[PDB]
Design a protein around this ligand. Structure first.
Ligand SMILES: CC(=O)N[C@H](C(=O)N1C[C@H](O)[C@H](F)[C@H]1C(=O)NCc1ccc(-c2scnc2C)cc1)C(C)(C)C
Lengths: 87, 104, 141
């Protein structure tokens, strides 16, 4: 199982499956095994990593799908990061 | 049933999944592959509680409906350097800024 | 192009809302015009009388966000076998993270203030371009 390291602006190092990270076309390009993000704080990048897990678990599933939750405090910063990462 | 986790030590966070029926020791094997440290140099935690190698993740309270993909459960990690284990330490995430006027 | 066929052949259906949103069923009439019907609260159902060859789609009643029905965009009632109704499972799609972020922001900021936000102009346009049934019909044609 291959993993990769995504690093926030504040130094937090998140470690996820390579398959999950390639959800983002932007990250796919920055690889083709670590990537630094100078604009994205850890409170945003953790939510991005949770979205990967969510997408891969519920894409094309006939079971019921729960809502992906987003706190109002982080909505604007997360919006900007999803626009950049194209996810 | 799959459970979804964040395994955290200092400024390191690992996102991974495991079976409810799998063991604490087997979770250390997973860490070993990623961080290159053998099981005997690792301690794992639910909050402040040290976890036994033989127990299942389900026994230790990680169930498929609490440890979800969009909201995974946290498992503490601590290493041994030489003779003694370090104290469990987890750096918090960054703080969000104040909500702008138009969102209040 | 997209319109119900006037078949006059009955078809009993169950609308089953397996989403957390309040649902608005939309019948496309014989001229292709969207016609709204009464809403379903989350986790509820209704047995209704439709007809073979008719077209339906489903939306969030308050924000008009698009929903899926038996895994897809459009639902068309078919022949009832053994007097059993056709099931119509209404669910959340896996929205992109971008589109989800827009939903939450729209629900927090009043449309007059989208411009006072500190973001690039093309995100102001993405916020103002809220989901709309007319556009999605044009798209799917
Ligand atoms: C012969 C024909 O095509 N009749 C149409 C008709 O009866 N329709 C069009 C659709 O097939 C629809 F299913 C049906 C209809 O209007 N049935 C009554 C009805 C009333 C309420 C509801 C709903 S939707 C959510 N809650 C309810 C109670 C569903 C169906 C007319 C009257 C609208 C022309």
């Amino acid at each position: 199982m291959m993993y990769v390291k995504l690093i926030s602006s504040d130094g937090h190092e998140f470690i996820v499956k390579r398959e999950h990270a390639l959800t983002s076309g932007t990250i796919k390009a920055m690889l083709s095994n670590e990537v630094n993000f100078r604009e994205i704080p850890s409170h945003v990048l953790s939510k991005v990593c949770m979205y990967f897990t969510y997408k891969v678990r519920y894409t094309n599933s006939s079971t019921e799908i729960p809502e992906f939750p987003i706190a109002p405090e982080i909505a604007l910063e997360l919006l900007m990061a999803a626009n950049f990462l194209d996810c | 049933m799959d459970v979804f986790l964040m395994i955290r030590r200092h400024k390191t966070t690992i996102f991974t999944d495991a079976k409810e029926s799998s063991t604490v020791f087997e979770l250390k094997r997973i860490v070993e592959g990623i961080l290159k440290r053998p099981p005997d140099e690792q301690r794992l935690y639910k909050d402040d509680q040290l976890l036994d190698d033989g127990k299942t993740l389900g026994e230790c309270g990680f169930t498929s409906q609490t440890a979800r993909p969009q909201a995974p459960a946290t498992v503490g990690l601590a290493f041994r350097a030489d003779d003694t284990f370090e104290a469990l330490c987890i750096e918090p995430f960054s703080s969000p800024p104040e909500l702008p006027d138009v969102m209040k | 192009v997209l319109r119900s066929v006037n078949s006059r052949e009955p078809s009993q259906v169950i609308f089953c809302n397996r989403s957390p949103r309040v649902v608005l069923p939309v019948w496309l009439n014989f001229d292709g015009e969207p016609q709204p019907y009464p809403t379903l609260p989350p986790g509820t159902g209704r047995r209704i009388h439709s007809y073979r060859g008719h077209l339906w789609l489903f939306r969030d009643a308050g924000t008009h966000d698009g929903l899926l029905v038996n895994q897809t965009e459009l639902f068309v009632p078919s022949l009832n076998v053994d007097g059993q109704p056709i099931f119509a499972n209404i669910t959340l799609p896996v929205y992109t993270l971008k589109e989800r972020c827009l939903q939450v922001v729209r629900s927090l900021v009043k449309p007059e203030n989208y411009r006072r936000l500190d973001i690039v102009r093309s995100l102001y346009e993405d916020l103002e371009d809220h989901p709309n049934v007319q556009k999605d019909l044009e798209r799917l044609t």
